[PDB]
Design a protein around this nucleic acid. Sequence first.
DNA 1: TTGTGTTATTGGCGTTATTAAGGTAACTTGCTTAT
Length: 52
Amino acid sequence: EIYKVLRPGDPPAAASVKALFEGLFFIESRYSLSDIGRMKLNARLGSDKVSK
DNA sequence: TTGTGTTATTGGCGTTATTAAGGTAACTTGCTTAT
């Protein structure tokens, strides 16, 4: 369903969207917070139990 | 004023440098481009 939103009128596949999503937020060379987003989120939530 | 000397051009010629056309047979198979 997400893959429809991102690419409308694009017939989905089996082993394609599995790359799309996990590359949308979960690729170290595609998305980052660079020591600041991490700290400003941790302190905002307290959860040191996530690696800063 | 009429003779003998240029000339300026102007279609023909060739010459060739430049442009266009075509052909290889080891196997090769679906981005998305990012306030």
